[PDB]
Design a protein around this ligand. Structure first.
Ligand SMILES: [Zn+2]
Ligand SMILES: [Zn+2]
Lengths: 94, 50, 116, 39
């Protein structure tokens, strides 16, 4: 009666690939801001057919102030024992 | 056993698993390159205190 | 001496004796995990130790400007450039033998003519 | 450059669902493989 929602952990979205990426100061200062990030396209990710090389191409919205091309260095090709989990409040009435 | 533990329930869910770890580094062959270097150099040059 | 570590909890595996087979088995003290030992050695006390003689050799040892240079020939690549340093063991019981590191192949040899 | 690669669009998540919701990183500390789906 206190909570109207299931308290068990949800595994529905567990089967979802995720990439952990560390960004520089200039790039991280604009992508982590909550006054932005409305769903617009920030760029494109290009992967070679044979792999082993990943690059990022941003759009022309940077105001020609930062490089438009970046190299995504895969620090760990195989990663285990890492997961992404969220949390939010529960309904309190009934 | 112990009859009380004082838990705090919350709505949690797994929204993905990490498979690749990446490090973003700007390409050295870009026309805008060497502008970040000046920006980085300005970090040490700055003197916030007065 | 090799210190094997547990597979299930990472704890070190101490030696244990099984009288049923009279063999050497390494077992965990907390999670009851067993493994057959590959060697019969259990303790290695080294009163006179030769370890650490060449400790600190890296891929760019030659870049150190303080290390002296020598013209002795490396007996693996026929090179004349090398840097030499005395034994790194600080106990006052070691000889003044040198150890030469070649700048062309990263090979370590000694100038000693007694034991080599 | 020749089209010898595969490129996909990169778009931001809508902010309407990011309010009152936080995403954290979970790191299992162990030498084995842990999978909550099966293990
Ligand atoms: Zn164990
Ligand atoms: Zn040599």
């Amino acid at each position: 009666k206190v909570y109207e929602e299931s308290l068990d952990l949800d595994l529905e979205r567990s089967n979802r690939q995720v990439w952990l990426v560390r960004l520089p100061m200039f790039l991280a200062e604009k992508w982590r801001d909550r006054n932005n990030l409305h769903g617009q396209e920030l760029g494109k990710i290009r992967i070679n057919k044979d792999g082993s090389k990943i690059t990022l191409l941003l759009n022309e919205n940077d105001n020609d102030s930062i490089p438009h091309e970046y190299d995504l260095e895969l620090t760990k090709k195989v990663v285990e024992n890492e997961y992404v989990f969220t949390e939010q409040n529960l309904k309190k009435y009934q | 056993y112990i009859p009380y533990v004082k838990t705090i329930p919350k709505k949690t869910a797994i929204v993905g698993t990490v498979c690749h770890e990446c490090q973003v580094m700007p390409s050295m062959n870009d026309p805008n390159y060497h502008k970040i270097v000046e920006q980085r150099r300005n970090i040490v040059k700055l003197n916030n205190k007065e | 001496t090799t210190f094997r570590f547990c597979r299930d909890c990472n704890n070190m595996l101490y030696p244990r004796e099984d009288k049923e087979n009279n063999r050497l088995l390494f077992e965990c003290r907390t999670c009851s995990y067993v493994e057959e030992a590959g060697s019969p050695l259990v303790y290695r006390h080294e009163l006179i130790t030769n370890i650490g003689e060449t400790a600190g050799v890296v891929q760019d040892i030659g870049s150190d400007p303080t290390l002296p240079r020598s013209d002795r020939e490396c007996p693996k690549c026929h090179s004349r450039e090398n840097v030499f340093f005395q034994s790194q063991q600080r106990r006052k019981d070691t000889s003044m033998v040198l150890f030469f590191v070649c700048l062309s192949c990263s090979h370590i040899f000694t100038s000693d003519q007694k034991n080599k | 450059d020749p089209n010898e690669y595969n490129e996909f669009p990169l778009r931001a998540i809508p902010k309407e669902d990011l309010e009152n919701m936080r995403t954290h990183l979970l790191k299992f500390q162990s030498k084995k493989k842990i999978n909550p789906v099966t293990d």
